Design a protein that fits this description.
Chain A: Putative oxygen sensor; modulates the activity of FixJ, a transcriptional activator of nitrogen fixation fixK gene. FixL probably acts as a kinase that phosphorylates FixJ. Chain A: Keywords: ATP-binding, Heme, Iron, Kinase, Metal-binding, Nitrogen fixation, Nucleotide-binding, Phosphoprotein, Repeat, Transferase, Two-component regulatory system. Two copies of one chain form a homodimer. Chain A is built from eight helices and ten strands. Chain A is α+β, with helices and mostly antiparallel strands and about 250 residues long. The first copy, chain A, is elongated. In chain A, strands 2-1-5-4-3 form a five-stranded antiparallel β-sheet. The first copy, chain A, has two domains: about 100 residues, PAS domain (Beta-Lactamase, 2-Layer Sandwich), CATH 3.30.450.20; about 120 residues, Beta-Lactamase (2-Layer Sandwich). Chains A and B meet through strand 4, strand 5, helix 4, strand 9 and strand 10 of A and strand 4, strand 5, helix 4, strand 9 and strand 10 of B. The complex binds protoporphyrin IX containing FE (2 copies). One protoporphyrin IX containing FE binds next to strand 6, helix 7, strand 8, strand 9 and strand 10 of chain B.
């Protein structure tokens, strides 16, 4: 109760009387000496979560319940206090549903973690759509997990077509049949042949046509499994320009 | 229902918890509420760190939260955040300790997902062949790839926080902040979508032909742009060789 760090509160469906903790007063940004009031509790809230609050108290009134709703208050000028109000029902007897008691939780840090994840996901999508090189992400066994827009244009598969399939569908033989062992050999020996180095190889479209590409791989670890992020650059025009360079310099020579 | 409730009074060392509280702990529902039973659900290294925490809160004053996982239900553990405070019987005697049990399995999944995305962001930043740069709505560098460091000669910690205009010659340098500013109001892109060959400037002072590709995104009321920069210094080496060789024919 002293230094608890969590607010507590009470509200009765009949007589609408409310008593919150002193730790709860600070969370609402008001109440230095003034008394607890449910109308005052409304005043601190912004007028969207308001209607969701009485919708919640009407929902928990009906037969049963469970009460948890989240909101932000205007405590400070350029910041908001995010609070998750959680509560449970206690009936007097078999007769009616009397006062509902609960807690106020400070969920500033949880919402901060939320937004950070949301930003990272949004940004990952932008990287996938914008990157000029074809970006492919596989798991420890070569199973495509992400497939960039450039990769779609280059290999002729869509993201939904490619994600879940083995990365060896992108390459001709013998590399297609050997690519699983390439990954397994790397994982046991830790001796890289393309990671950090880079290699020009031949990639294969869904058409069946083949094209010269530069491959670059980087590794990561998540939940006990590695993931490999590949970057593919189409060298079909680069060696086409080299084919121009060598044959045009022949008629000079 | 709601979250679980419990109290462990320091006087008489008893402990009682609510009906939703015991389901969170994985209580067999025959067992009664005892403090030695609570410590039997926790895993060994968690156990001692919990018991380290109560010893640090044995000092009269304050509050107590710990997070842990019990694992006997689904092969993936149940995460609980146990938060508690003190009440005092008299002026100098602390008697009861009352608090709550919070299911936080969702809170730990978002943590892990964020961790994975952050790890993958670092992997891309190290590995992408083109220079990747990320700016906010005002042109301040927020992320700076390894390839960008090698191309522009600034370090990540040097570049981040600085305006992106330090990467380009004049007059683009002085005009770049207007370019972003006009784009934000008008929404008419000139490089977003299209892809422009421009000239960039290293910290050296030297310049080079680069290709710029920009992608937009929105987060927290501010746009962010991700620039992909490719050096064309060897591409135009071959283009100059092609131009000289086919001009020597005519
Ligand atoms: C699409 C055409 C591709 C071809 C032809 C190809 C070919 C190869 C070859 C030949 C090796 C082994 C080199 C050696 O042992 O001498 C290799 C290794 C490997 N590749 Fe692929 N690859 C392709 C795409 C990818 C992509 C897109 C990824 C990841 C997203 C990837 C992941 C790996 C990994 C993890 C290894 C083992 C690590 C290493 O040897 O450094 N490959 N690849
Ligand atoms: C380093 C050398 C760079 C140069 C020389 C350069 C040049 C330019 C120019 C000339 C424009 C205006 C186009 C016009 O009005 O016709 C522009 C716009 C823009 N640039 Fe830069 N840029 C550079 C780097 C970057 C990077 C790395 C990013 C992103 C991280 C970026 C973000 C933007 C944005 C958001 C716009 C406005 C939207 C648009 O017009 O597409 N710039 N840039």
């Amino acid at each position: 109760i002293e230094g608890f760090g969590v607010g507590t509160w009470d509200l009765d469906l009949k007589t609408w009387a409310l008593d919150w903790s002193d730790t709860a007063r600070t969370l609402l940004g008001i109440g230095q000496d003034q008394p607890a009031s449910y109308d005052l509790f409304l005043s601190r809230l912004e007028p969207d979560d308001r209607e969701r609050v009485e919708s919640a108290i009407k929902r928990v009134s009906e037969r049963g319940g469970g009460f948890d709703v989240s909101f932000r208050v205007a405590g400070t000028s350029n910041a908001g206090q995010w609070i998750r109000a959680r509560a449970g029902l206690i009936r007097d007897e078999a007769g009616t549903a009397r006062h509902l008691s609960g807690i106020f939780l400070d969920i500033d840090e949880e919402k901060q973690v939320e937004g950070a994840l949301r930003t990272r996901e949004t940004h990952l999508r932008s990287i996938l759509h914008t990157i000029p090189d074809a970006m492919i992400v596989i798991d420890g066994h070569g199973i495509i997990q992400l497939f960039s827009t450039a990769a779609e244009r280059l290999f002729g598969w869509s993201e939904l077509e490619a994600i879940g399939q083995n990365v060896n569908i992108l390459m001709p033989e013998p590399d297609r049949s050997r690519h699983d062992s390439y990954i397994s050999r790397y994982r046991t020996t830790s001796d890289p042949h393309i990671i950090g180095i880079g290699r020009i190889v031949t990639g294969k479209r869904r058409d069946g046509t083949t094209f010269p590409m530069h491959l670059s791989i980087g590794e990561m670890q998540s939940g006990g499994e590695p993931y490999f992020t590949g970057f593919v650059r189409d060298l079909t025009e680069h060696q086409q320009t080299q084919a121009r360079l060598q044959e045009l310099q022949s008629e000079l020579v």
